[PDB]
Design a protein around this nucleic acid. Sequence first.
RNA 1: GUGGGAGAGGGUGGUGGAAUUCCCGGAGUAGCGGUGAAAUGCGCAGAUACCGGGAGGAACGCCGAUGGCGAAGGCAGCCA
RNA 2: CCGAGGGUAGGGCCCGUGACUGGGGCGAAGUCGUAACAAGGUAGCUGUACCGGAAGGUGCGGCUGGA
RNA 3: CGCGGGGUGGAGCAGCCUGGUAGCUCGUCGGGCUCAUAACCCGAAGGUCGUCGGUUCAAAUCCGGCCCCCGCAACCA
RNA 4: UCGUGGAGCCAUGGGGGAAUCUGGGCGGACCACCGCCUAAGGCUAAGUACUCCGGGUGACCGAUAGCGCACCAGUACCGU
RNA 5: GUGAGACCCAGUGGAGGCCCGAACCGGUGGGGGAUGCAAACCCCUCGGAUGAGCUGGGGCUAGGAGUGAAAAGCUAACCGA
RNA 6: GCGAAUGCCGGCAUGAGUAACGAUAAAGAGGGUGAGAAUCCCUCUCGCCGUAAGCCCAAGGGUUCCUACGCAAUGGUCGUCAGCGUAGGGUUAGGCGGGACCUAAGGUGAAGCCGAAAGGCGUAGCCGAAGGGCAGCCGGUUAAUAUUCCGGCCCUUCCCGCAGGUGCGAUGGGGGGACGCUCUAGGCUAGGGGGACCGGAGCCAUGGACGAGCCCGGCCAGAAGCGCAGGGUGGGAGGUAGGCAAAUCCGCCUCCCAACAAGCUCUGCGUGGUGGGGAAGCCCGCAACCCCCCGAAGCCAGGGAGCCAAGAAAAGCCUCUAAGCACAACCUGCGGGAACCCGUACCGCAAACCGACACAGGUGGGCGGGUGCAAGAGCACUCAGGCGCGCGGGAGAACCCUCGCCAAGGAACUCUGCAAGUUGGCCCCGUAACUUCGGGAGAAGGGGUGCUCCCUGGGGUGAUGAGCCCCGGGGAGCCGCAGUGAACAGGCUCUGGCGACUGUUUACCAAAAACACAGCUCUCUGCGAACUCGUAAGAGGAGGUAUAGGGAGCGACGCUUGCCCGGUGCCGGAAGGUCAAGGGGAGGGGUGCAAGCCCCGAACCGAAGCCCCGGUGAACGGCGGCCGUAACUAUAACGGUCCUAAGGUAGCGAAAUUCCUUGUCGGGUAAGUUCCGACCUGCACGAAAAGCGUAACGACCGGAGCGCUGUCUCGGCGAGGGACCCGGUGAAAUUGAACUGGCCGUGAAGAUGCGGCCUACCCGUGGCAGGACGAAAAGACCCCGUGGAGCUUUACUGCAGCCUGG
RNA 7: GAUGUCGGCUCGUCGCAUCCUGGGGCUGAAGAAGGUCCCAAGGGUUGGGCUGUUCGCCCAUUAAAGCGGCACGCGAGCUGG
Lengths: 271, 48
Amino acid sequence: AVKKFKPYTPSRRFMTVADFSEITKTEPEKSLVKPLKKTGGRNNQGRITVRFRGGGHKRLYRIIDFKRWDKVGIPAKVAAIEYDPNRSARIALLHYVDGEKRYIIAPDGLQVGQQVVAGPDAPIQVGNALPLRFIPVGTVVHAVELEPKKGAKLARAAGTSAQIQGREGDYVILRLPSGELRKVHGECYATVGAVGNADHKNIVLGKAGRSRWLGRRPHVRGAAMNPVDHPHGGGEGRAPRGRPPASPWGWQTKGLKTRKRRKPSSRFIIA
Amino acid sequence: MKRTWQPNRRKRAKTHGFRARMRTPGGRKVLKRRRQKGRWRLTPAVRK
RNA sequence: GUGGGAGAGGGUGGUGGAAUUCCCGGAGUAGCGGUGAAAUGCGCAGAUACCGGGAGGAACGCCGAUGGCGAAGGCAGCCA
RNA sequence: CCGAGGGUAGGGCCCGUGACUGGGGCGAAGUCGUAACAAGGUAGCUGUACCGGAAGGUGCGGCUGGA
RNA sequence: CGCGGGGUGGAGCAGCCUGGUAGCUCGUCGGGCUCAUAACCCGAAGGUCGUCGGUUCAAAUCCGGCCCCCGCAACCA
RNA sequence: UCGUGGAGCCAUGGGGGAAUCUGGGCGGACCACCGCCUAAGGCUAAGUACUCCGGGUGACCGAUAGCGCACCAGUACCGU
RNA sequence: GUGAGACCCAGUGGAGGCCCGAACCGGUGGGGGAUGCAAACCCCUCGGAUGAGCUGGGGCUAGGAGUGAAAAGCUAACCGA
RNA sequence: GCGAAUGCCGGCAUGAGUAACGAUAAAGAGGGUGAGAAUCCCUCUCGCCGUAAGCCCAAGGGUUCCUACGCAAUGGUCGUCAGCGUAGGGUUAGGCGGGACCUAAGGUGAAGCCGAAAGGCGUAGCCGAAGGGCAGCCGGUUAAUAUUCCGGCCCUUCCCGCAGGUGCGAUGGGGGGACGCUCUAGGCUAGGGGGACCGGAGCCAUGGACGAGCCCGGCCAGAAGCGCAGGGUGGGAGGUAGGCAAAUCCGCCUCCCAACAAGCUCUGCGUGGUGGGGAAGCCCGCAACCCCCCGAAGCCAGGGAGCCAAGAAAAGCCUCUAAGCACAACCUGCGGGAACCCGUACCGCAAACCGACACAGGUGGGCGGGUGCAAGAGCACUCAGGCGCGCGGGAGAACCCUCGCCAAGGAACUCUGCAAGUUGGCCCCGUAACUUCGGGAGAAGGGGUGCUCCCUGGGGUGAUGAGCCCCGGGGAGCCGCAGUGAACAGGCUCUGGCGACUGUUUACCAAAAACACAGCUCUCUGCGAACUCGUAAGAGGAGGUAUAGGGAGCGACGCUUGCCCGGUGCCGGAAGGUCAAGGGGAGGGGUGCAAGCCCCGAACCGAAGCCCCGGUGAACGGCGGCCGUAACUAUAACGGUCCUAAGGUAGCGAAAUUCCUUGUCGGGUAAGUUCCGACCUGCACGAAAAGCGUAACGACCGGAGCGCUGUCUCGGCGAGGGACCCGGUGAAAUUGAACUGGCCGUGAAGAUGCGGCCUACCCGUGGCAGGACGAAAAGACCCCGUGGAGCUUUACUGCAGCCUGG
RNA sequence: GAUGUCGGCUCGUCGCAUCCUGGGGCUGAAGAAGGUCCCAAGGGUUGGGCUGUUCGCCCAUUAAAGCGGCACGCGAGCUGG
Ligand SMILES: NC[C@@H]1O[C@H](O[C@H]2[C@@H](O)[C@H](O[C@@H]3[C@@H](O)[C@H](N)C[C@H](N)[C@H]3O[C@H]3O[C@H](CO)[C@@H](O)[C@H](O)[C@H]3N)O[C@@H]2CO)[C@H](N)[C@@H](O)[C@@H]1O
Ligand SMILES: [Mg+2]
Ligand SMILES: [Mg+2]
Ligand SMILES: [Mg+2]
Ligand SMILES: [Mg+2]
Ligand SMILES: [Mg+2]
Ligand SMILES: [Mg+2]
Ligand SMILES: [Mg+2]
Ligand SMILES: [Mg+2]
Ligand SMILES: [Mg+2]
Ligand SMILES: [Mg+2]
Ligand SMILES: [Mg+2]
Ligand SMILES: [Mg+2]
Ligand SMILES: [Mg+2]
Ligand SMILES: [Mg+2]
Ligand SMILES: [Mg+2]
Ligand SMILES: [Mg+2]
Ligand SMILES: [Mg+2]
Ligand SMILES: [Mg+2]
Ligand SMILES: [Mg+2]
Ligand SMILES: [Mg+2]
Ligand SMILES: [Mg+2]
Ligand SMILES: [Mg+2]
Ligand SMILES: [Mg+2]
Ligand SMILES: [Mg+2]
Ligand SMILES: [Mg+2]
Ligand SMILES: [Mg+2]
Ligand SMILES: [Mg+2]
Ligand SMILES: [Mg+2]
Ligand SMILES: [Mg+2]
Ligand SMILES: [Mg+2]
Ligand SMILES: [Mg+2]
Ligand SMILES: [Mg+2]
Ligand SMILES: [Mg+2]
Ligand SMILES: [Mg+2]
Ligand SMILES: [Mg+2]
Ligand SMILES: [Mg+2]
Ligand SMILES: [Mg+2]
Ligand SMILES: [Mg+2]
Ligand SMILES: [Mg+2]
Ligand SMILES: [Mg+2]
Ligand SMILES: [Mg+2]
Ligand SMILES: [Mg+2]
Ligand SMILES: [Mg+2]
Ligand SMILES: [Mg+2]
Ligand SMILES: [Mg+2]
Ligand SMILES: [Mg+2]
Ligand SMILES: [Mg+2]
Ligand SMILES: [Mg+2]
Ligand SMILES: [Mg+2]
Ligand SMILES: [Mg+2]
Ligand SMILES: [Mg+2]
Ligand SMILES: [Mg+2]
Ligand SMILES: [Mg+2]
Ligand SMILES: [Mg+2]
Ligand SMILES: [Mg+2]
Ligand SMILES: [Mg+2]
Ligand SMILES: [Mg+2]
Ligand SMILES: [Mg+2]
Ligand SMILES: [Mg+2]
Ligand SMILES: [Mg+2]
Ligand SMILES: [Mg+2]
Ligand SMILES: [Mg+2]
Ligand SMILES: [Mg+2]
Ligand SMILES: [Mg+2]
Ligand SMILES: [Mg+2]
Ligand SMILES: [Mg+2]
Ligand SMILES: [Mg+2]
Ligand SMILES: [Mg+2]
Ligand SMILES: [Mg+2]
Ligand SMILES: [Mg+2]
Ligand SMILES: [Mg+2]
Ligand SMILES: [Mg+2]
Ligand SMILES: [Mg+2]
Ligand SMILES: [Mg+2]
Ligand SMILES: [Mg+2]
Ligand SMILES: [Mg+2]
Ligand SMILES: [Mg+2]
Ligand SMILES: [Mg+2]
Ligand SMILES: [Mg+2]
Ligand SMILES: [Mg+2]
Ligand SMILES: [Mg+2]
Ligand SMILES: [Mg+2]
Ligand SMILES: [Mg+2]
Ligand SMILES: [Mg+2]
Ligand SMILES: [Mg+2]
Ligand SMILES: [Mg+2]
Ligand SMILES: [Mg+2]
Ligand SMILES: [Mg+2]
Ligand SMILES: [Mg+2]
Ligand SMILES: [Mg+2]
Ligand SMILES: [Mg+2]
Ligand SMILES: [Mg+2]
Ligand SMILES: [Mg+2]
Ligand SMILES: [Mg+2]
Ligand SMILES: [Mg+2]
Ligand SMILES: [Mg+2]
Ligand SMILES: [Mg+2]
Ligand SMILES: [Mg+2]
Ligand SMILES: [Mg+2]
Ligand SMILES: [Mg+2]
Ligand SMILES: [Mg+2]
Ligand SMILES: [Mg+2]
Ligand SMILES: [Mg+2]
Ligand SMILES: [Mg+2]
Ligand SMILES: [Mg+2]
Ligand SMILES: [Mg+2]
Ligand SMILES: [Mg+2]
Ligand SMILES: [Mg+2]
Ligand SMILES: [Mg+2]
Ligand SMILES: [Mg+2]
Ligand SMILES: [Mg+2]
Ligand SMILES: [Mg+2]
Ligand SMILES: [Mg+2]
Ligand SMILES: [Mg+2]
Ligand SMILES: [Mg+2]
Ligand SMILES: [Mg+2]
Ligand SMILES: [Mg+2]
Ligand SMILES: [Mg+2]
Ligand SMILES: [Mg+2]
Ligand SMILES: [Mg+2]
Ligand SMILES: [Mg+2]
Ligand SMILES: [Mg+2]
Ligand SMILES: [Mg+2]
Ligand SMILES: [Mg+2]
Ligand SMILES: [Mg+2]
Ligand SMILES: [Mg+2]
Ligand SMILES: [Mg+2]
Ligand SMILES: [Mg+2]
Ligand SMILES: [Mg+2]
Ligand SMILES: [Mg+2]
Ligand SMILES: [Mg+2]
Ligand SMILES: [Mg+2]
Ligand SMILES: [Mg+2]
Ligand SMILES: [Mg+2]
Ligand SMILES: [Mg+2]
Ligand SMILES: [Mg+2]
Ligand SMILES: [Mg+2]
Ligand SMILES: [Mg+2]
Ligand SMILES: [Mg+2]
Ligand SMILES: [Mg+2]
Ligand SMILES: [Mg+2]
Ligand SMILES: [Mg+2]
Ligand SMILES: [Mg+2]
Ligand SMILES: [Mg+2]
Ligand SMILES: [Mg+2]
Ligand SMILES: [Mg+2]
Ligand SMILES: [Mg+2]
Ligand SMILES: [Mg+2]
Ligand SMILES: [Mg+2]
Ligand SMILES: [Mg+2]
Ligand SMILES: [Mg+2]
Ligand SMILES: [Mg+2]
Ligand SMILES: [Mg+2]
Ligand SMILES: [Mg+2]
Ligand SMILES: [Mg+2]
Ligand SMILES: [Mg+2]
Ligand SMILES: [Mg+2]
Ligand SMILES: [Mg+2]
Ligand SMILES: [Mg+2]
Ligand SMILES: [Mg+2]
Ligand SMILES: [Mg+2]
Ligand SMILES: [Mg+2]
Ligand SMILES: [Mg+2]
Ligand SMILES: [Mg+2]
Ligand SMILES: [Mg+2]
Ligand SMILES: [Mg+2]
Ligand SMILES: [Mg+2]
Ligand SMILES: [Mg+2]
Ligand SMILES: [Mg+2]
Ligand SMILES: [Mg+2]
Ligand SMILES: [Mg+2]
Ligand SMILES: [Mg+2]
Ligand SMILES: [Mg+2]
Ligand SMILES: [Mg+2]
Ligand SMILES: [Mg+2]
Ligand SMILES: [Mg+2]
Ligand SMILES: [Mg+2]
Ligand SMILES: [Mg+2]
Ligand SMILES: [Mg+2]
Ligand SMILES: [Mg+2]
Ligand SMILES: [Mg+2]
Ligand SMILES: [Mg+2]
Ligand SMILES: [Mg+2]
Ligand SMILES: [Mg+2]
Ligand SMILES: [Mg+2]
Ligand SMILES: [Mg+2]
Ligand SMILES: [Mg+2]
Ligand SMILES: [Mg+2]
Ligand SMILES: [Mg+2]
Ligand SMILES: [Mg+2]
Ligand SMILES: [Mg+2]
Ligand SMILES: [Mg+2]
Ligand SMILES: [Mg+2]
Ligand SMILES: [Mg+2]
Ligand SMILES: [Mg+2]
Ligand SMILES: [Mg+2]
Ligand SMILES: [Mg+2]
Ligand SMILES: [Mg+2]
Ligand SMILES: [Mg+2]
Ligand SMILES: [Mg+2]
Ligand SMILES: [Mg+2]
Ligand SMILES: [Mg+2]
Ligand SMILES: [Mg+2]
Ligand SMILES: [Mg+2]
Ligand SMILES: [Mg+2]
Ligand SMILES: [Mg+2]
Ligand SMILES: [Mg+2]
Ligand SMILES: [Mg+2]
Ligand SMILES: [Mg+2]
Ligand SMILES: [Mg+2]
Ligand SMILES: [Mg+2]
Ligand SMILES: [Mg+2]
Ligand SMILES: [Mg+2]
Ligand SMILES: [Mg+2]
Ligand SMILES: [Mg+2]
Ligand SMILES: [Mg+2]
């Protein structure tokens, strides 16, 4: 839905925020070895190596389960659906019959009360994980793994998802969120359903700050700087680049493909 | 107005200290050069 | 009120084959396409023509009517 | 106290005039094409939409006041 | 003021650095089709090449001087 | 001395890769003679270099000189 | 209020890079100052003031390098190195 | 061998008894002291501060602290005084703050990884604090210390003995510690105000008052118990696939009871045995200690509500079992004993810290009383407490600074209303276009405002009732020029430009129309992501995963964003052209008597790149000319032709763009090179280096009005601080030497200095700036030097990086 | 090894090739006017609108609203459009 505000102040006549009803029934994290001190920091060993990051509200890190083959067959009830500052997606706190509690990136549709489980035996329904091989071609899934046992790495952003296009050998063809067609091993797990909280792509930040609360500091334009700072910089009084769109480091930034050519990763891609 | 020198005992020790000067080969050379010139104070004398 | 009838009335979910386009593989060679006649265009970097495998979208041939339903605009594959 | 009226300030309605600009009505024989009336030589029309010297042309849907 | 480009039948353009050979489209004129005007068809006429003089056997064509049309420049003070 | 030169020799990062005296390197590309020497393990005084240190001298200075300091100087003072 | 709604009222409520304005953070115009009180100061005036706020202490990044809401600005009173 | 090098070092001059003596909070006098006092000590007047100019703590400073002696120098004067000189004292802790505790960022760093060496990452561990954890309150003393010594009251650890208890026991498990922002309830407390009440030495002045008068003061701490507020918390009983299962502890299910609770716990606050303090008053000496009211930003605290940006760690502490050990061992009592190290002076918004100075500057935390004003930490006055700023005394010029006032006029000033005025708080009336419906709004324009007396409504606390406070409502009445009577305290409106907005910036000449910004588009990137730093290891990205992350441009929102892929870039093309090693060896050469050994070397097979083919504009970019033509003329819908990759669309237009140009009309003005509206031969607008608009916003830039004024006609008077004079102290740039006049000539072309002529006794003081081509800076501009740097690219040549064959 | 550059403000002084005001000769001078030349600066030679402007062009006046030199006089006198 997204909450909108009356214009009782500019920057706030455009501002809009998430429908937090989805979450509710729990704001406090499941402390139980669930959150960890999380180190902030826009740089590595001294130098900033990603520009314009910093500041931004204090943040606790919830550790979530991205490889569910741990508890194969051990079912669990969905305790709650909480808020995670560290992601676009919302998480779900789930108590296992085992007694062990874990977190999972909350799929769309999942509800407090439902039961869930991962395994080959597992029933094909929202929240359940299984190797892609045992998932019916056509079903939508999220939190897909890339190589087996390596853990989930695909379709995890709010409202994202992958769809099975069909098997072919030990591999199964997935159409990824981006739209790429990749062959992924059949043993790679993946929980059924879409990522949920798809209204996300619609929230309008609103003001200059807030972009700040999210830890994103101002991004200054190339042309605005000087010959020394960027290739675009310079020229007496406003100019047009000067041919041909480039990054501060000098590589062309409009259309120039960048992924490695001889990458073995290919052969399993097509899109 | 707020001037350049703002004395901090701990900062001074941790920066120009003896131990500090010892860790870095550059510093060890400083201690060397000074000791060899005859300085009475090899390091910024400061008491705590 | 009780008992029954017909209907492309409406809304939701699901599903079927035909055909177009594109992708992959095969086989195959000098044109294809288009018109009043042409040209642009496509094709020896292997097109058109044919087979196989696949993706996706929109529309529902025969029944179909000079027919039916709706207050009008309008409503047509099958299923609940 | 009330008070004609004067004063100050801010609104409302109406009339005149206004560089310049917009269509419009009207005027024997000026210019360009030829949309429409007969398959008007691409059936006409039509609400909408884009476009063009101009009539108009095309899209989509509808009408017969065309076959 | 200083640079460079251009004046060719009636209009708009070729020809000129590689001199002897003036080409194209439109218009103009005579004749056809049409009741007729266009369109369309056949045929034809028209060019100090801006100039003043010079080189050459020979000059639109090469070399100078003038009259022109259009552009480019004109900065530090 | 050798700056690609006719460029050997001595080193050696990469590739190929022997033989043990009928073995193997060199004598300035390369061949052939003639001749030199024995690689892929190691050690080895003296003659040689310097002057923090002790001494001796000086057509060296004599307190703006001579070491920055003849004196309580790498001090005072200056600088994070 | 209506079939049910939308919606409209009061009341409560106390949102906001909202308003005025001290502390605090600035530095708009003018005047004074110019061997200064001061190698950037003073008086009047003015901007922000729950936020992209201010600030103490502890830490990290540096010379073709850092840092930069971008002036070639800042990097110990003069930085195109 | 010195005369010059803006030479180097030192000394001493000149300016000059000049500027200045460092906030315009302010001084006077009487006593002392002494060789000498405006300046030291005492007293009495006076003025200034009083969210301080007063207290307390951190940092830094290191003896400046206290006492006795002293005055050369140091204090911008003086000095008997001092932060100065000499000497001697002075800083006391189980509880305050640190360490024999804990962890943060980060640092270090066994293992482990990397790197010519130096060295770089880095696990465990260790280090690291204004954060966590932890036991002291009220008084009293010294010249100087005190939560440190002492008094009273109250605690903390360890060790021993002892009685009484229990499965005791980890560096392991679990719980816990434990956390945001904004808004808030109920009690409290700190703090403050009154009192007809309590206790007091005293005072009746000057016209009055013996007064329910005036004046002073009416508390602090305090175990257990005791109350009053709160914070925490369901009890049971069984199973169990988890807590890298070792558990009767967690966690999970299952099930009797019970729940806007009770009890159990843990704080806060009163109360408390009792200890402590205790003024105004003369001679240096009298004690109560009660009652109302206001009341926190603090306490109960882990209280509650709402919100999105979703808010440290570890130890102590509970609990659980492991080995083990059950003679251990822990637990509770109770007496005895034991209890280390470092800091403690003083300054601390400043004369002791950072600014070379006793420098109008800078410096984090807490307290910060009273009255009045709507409120307040604001403003005015004032407590406590602290100061009068380390040169003074006169005079009463110009001129300067800061300040007050002004006839008549009222922007005529001027680049410009620059500056100054006006307005100003609160209550009430009452308010337009336009708009994104919030706003514009404090629009504008007005009225009221003091005190006196009467009537009258709600509340809080009490108790319902009186006091005490908090909000009000209505009549009359008094006095001034004036009632927010002083101080704090908007001038307003109309119409343009730019940027949407709050915000950032050139520390120290630019605060802006610049940057940023939400938002739009393009593009890269399938995760060991792209990209960035690094030789590397490794790291950031990100414990993220295309609703994500990098790069680019545009820059809210509205309506929109045309045509040209010729060139350039980028994307796509398994074909061809070309193409390096390398493979391949037709063929040829050097030598040998030779087998040989050596050299060249064509066909042909050989990547990426370039070529070629195609796409591509919110990629770099580009987006025409010349003739003719209507039945008055003008003009040209229409036509011809040349060129192109295509010839600029909507919209806007003499503009932040228009040269000609003060374009031409219209508006405003008495008059308008600016402004607004129109037009359009746009020298040279135009669509994301976006185009045209837009409510609101702006210390942004332009044009008008009203108000109001010393801006001005046009200047006048007055005040304070300087200037001037006297006493004290006493600089600076500059300076070839000077005995340094005018004119007209002359001269290297602008003469005190040459010529001629003309004035002119010697020397100062207060003023003014025409000259000394005055000072200050070896001119920035300019040119020059085969000088230097920063920047650019289809300049040359390299290197990183990346692509590529072997 | 530096002579501050436009305009304005303030203070002026000088030249005459005179814009007023004084004398005067011609006149196609009737008068009143004017025109042109001659002598003569003693003293005069306004306030606004527009522009940085000098200069101009306007508005309202006047006897007239003169020209030009003094480093396009004057920044150790001010202003900085
Ligand atoms: N006709 C009046 C209105 O305006 C237009 O009509 C105007 C024009 O179309 C029309 O112009 C015509 C022209 O069309 C036609 N081809 C040629 C003719 N000579 C012109 O005629 C015009 O001009 C002449 C003078 O020159 C006058 O005398 C005459 O009255 C006038 N109508 O003249 C009309 C003016 O009245 C609309 N087309 C018409 O439907 C409408 O009703
Ligand atoms: Mg930006
Ligand atoms: Mg810039
Ligand atoms: Mg830099
Ligand atoms: Mg570039
Ligand atoms: Mg560059
Ligand atoms: Mg430009
Ligand atoms: Mg550029
Ligand atoms: Mg200093
Ligand atoms: Mg410290
Ligand atoms: Mg040291
Ligand atoms: Mg020192
Ligand atoms: Mg269907
Ligand atoms: Mg099909
Ligand atoms: Mg197609
Ligand atoms: Mg095929
Ligand atoms: Mg084939
Ligand atoms: Mg085809
Ligand atoms: Mg019907
Ligand atoms: Mg339907
Ligand atoms: Mg009346
Ligand atoms: Mg009108
Ligand atoms: Mg009208
Ligand atoms: Mg008309
Ligand atoms: Mg008409
Ligand atoms: Mg006619
Ligand atoms: Mg038609
Ligand atoms: Mg029509
Ligand atoms: Mg027709
Ligand atoms: Mg037709
Ligand atoms: Mg047709
Ligand atoms: Mg119609
Ligand atoms: Mg058109
Ligand atoms: Mg049109
Ligand atoms: Mg046209
Ligand atoms: Mg069309
Ligand atoms: Mg139509
Ligand atoms: Mg149609
Ligand atoms: Mg139709
Ligand atoms: Mg119909
Ligand atoms: Mg029809
Ligand atoms: Mg039909
Ligand atoms: Mg011709
Ligand atoms: Mg011929
Ligand atoms: Mg011809
Ligand atoms: Mg003919
Ligand atoms: Mg004929
Ligand atoms: Mg042998
Ligand atoms: Mg050898
Ligand atoms: Mg060899
Ligand atoms: Mg040899
Ligand atoms: Mg030889
Ligand atoms: Mg040898
Ligand atoms: Mg040896
Ligand atoms: Mg030896
Ligand atoms: Mg020797
Ligand atoms: Mg001697
Ligand atoms: Mg010496
Ligand atoms: Mg001597
Ligand atoms: Mg010595
Ligand atoms: Mg109804
Ligand atoms: Mg409400
Ligand atoms: Mg605000
Ligand atoms: Mg504001
Ligand atoms: Mg404010
Ligand atoms: Mg000034
Ligand atoms: Mg302010
Ligand atoms: Mg620090
Ligand atoms: Mg810091
Ligand atoms: Mg550098
Ligand atoms: Mg600096
Ligand atoms: Mg440099
Ligand atoms: Mg340098
Ligand atoms: Mg000399
Ligand atoms: Mg000297
Ligand atoms: Mg001197
Ligand atoms: Mg003097
Ligand atoms: Mg004097
Ligand atoms: Mg003086
Ligand atoms: Mg003083
Ligand atoms: Mg005495
Ligand atoms: Mg006072
Ligand atoms: Mg200290
Ligand atoms: Mg001392
Ligand atoms: Mg003292
Ligand atoms: Mg004494
Ligand atoms: Mg003295
Ligand atoms: Mg004495
Ligand atoms: Mg002393
Ligand atoms: Mg202690
Ligand atoms: Mg750490
Ligand atoms: Mg390390
Ligand atoms: Mg290290
Ligand atoms: Mg520690
Ligand atoms: Mg601590
Ligand atoms: Mg904390
Ligand atoms: Mg804690
Ligand atoms: Mg602490
Ligand atoms: Mg303690
Ligand atoms: Mg106590
Ligand atoms: Mg003391
Ligand atoms: Mg136990
Ligand atoms: Mg634990
Ligand atoms: Mg824990
Ligand atoms: Mg806690
Ligand atoms: Mg309360
Ligand atoms: Mg109290
Ligand atoms: Mg009292
Ligand atoms: Mg009383
Ligand atoms: Mg009396
Ligand atoms: Mg009390
Ligand atoms: Mg008590
Ligand atoms: Mg107790
Ligand atoms: Mg209780
Ligand atoms: Mg229970
Ligand atoms: Mg175990
Ligand atoms: Mg259990
Ligand atoms: Mg008591
Ligand atoms: Mg009582
Ligand atoms: Mg209360
Ligand atoms: Mg055991
Ligand atoms: Mg046991
Ligand atoms: Mg010890
Ligand atoms: Mg003390
Ligand atoms: Mg303070
Ligand atoms: Mg000070
Ligand atoms: Mg100091
Ligand atoms: Mg002083
Ligand atoms: Mg402060
Ligand atoms: Mg008030
Ligand atoms: Mg105050
Ligand atoms: Mg005076
Ligand atoms: Mg006046
Ligand atoms: Mg008056
Ligand atoms: Mg004016
Ligand atoms: Mg004026
Ligand atoms: Mg102006
Ligand atoms: Mg002003
Ligand atoms: Mg209005
Ligand atoms: Mg209206
Ligand atoms: Mg307004
Ligand atoms: Mg207004
Ligand atoms: Mg009164
Ligand atoms: Mg007042
Ligand atoms: Mg004020
Ligand atoms: Mg406009
Ligand atoms: Mg702005
Ligand atoms: Mg702002
Ligand atoms: Mg900044
Ligand atoms: Mg700033
Ligand atoms: Mg600045
Ligand atoms: Mg500003
Ligand atoms: Mg400024
Ligand atoms: Mg900026
Ligand atoms: Mg990470
Ligand atoms: Mg991005
Ligand atoms: Mg992106
Ligand atoms: Mg921009
Ligand atoms: Mg823009
Ligand atoms: Mg549109
Ligand atoms: Mg192109
Ligand atoms: Mg192309
Ligand atoms: Mg390709
Ligand atoms: Mg080869
Ligand atoms: Mg041979
Ligand atoms: Mg070869
Ligand atoms: Mg190739
Ligand atoms: Mg054209
Ligand atoms: Mg005509
Ligand atoms: Mg005619
Ligand atoms: Mg005619
Ligand atoms: Mg014409
Ligand atoms: Mg035409
Ligand atoms: Mg177009
Ligand atoms: Mg225009
Ligand atoms: Mg104009
Ligand atoms: Mg322009
Ligand atoms: Mg103009
Ligand atoms: Mg102009
Ligand atoms: Mg007029
Ligand atoms: Mg006018
Ligand atoms: Mg103006
Ligand atoms: Mg004006
Ligand atoms: Mg205009
Ligand atoms: Mg243009
Ligand atoms: Mg533009
Ligand atoms: Mg475009
Ligand atoms: Mg553009
Ligand atoms: Mg605009
Ligand atoms: Mg406009
Ligand atoms: Mg502004
Ligand atoms: Mg304005
Ligand atoms: Mg005016
Ligand atoms: Mg005045
Ligand atoms: Mg004196
Ligand atoms: Mg002369
Ligand atoms: Mg003379
Ligand atoms: Mg002489
Ligand atoms: Mg004098
Ligand atoms: Mg002078
Ligand atoms: Mg000079
Ligand atoms: Mg020079
Ligand atoms: Mg320069
Ligand atoms: Mg040269
Ligand atoms: Mg090159
Ligand atoms: Mg010179
Ligand atoms: Mg000179
Ligand atoms: Mg004369
Ligand atoms: Mg005169
Ligand atoms: Mg002006
Ligand atoms: Mg003017
Ligand atoms: Mg002259
Ligand atoms: Mg003059
Ligand atoms: Mg001048
Ligand atoms: Mg002077
Ligand atoms: Mg200026
Ligand atoms: Mg200025």
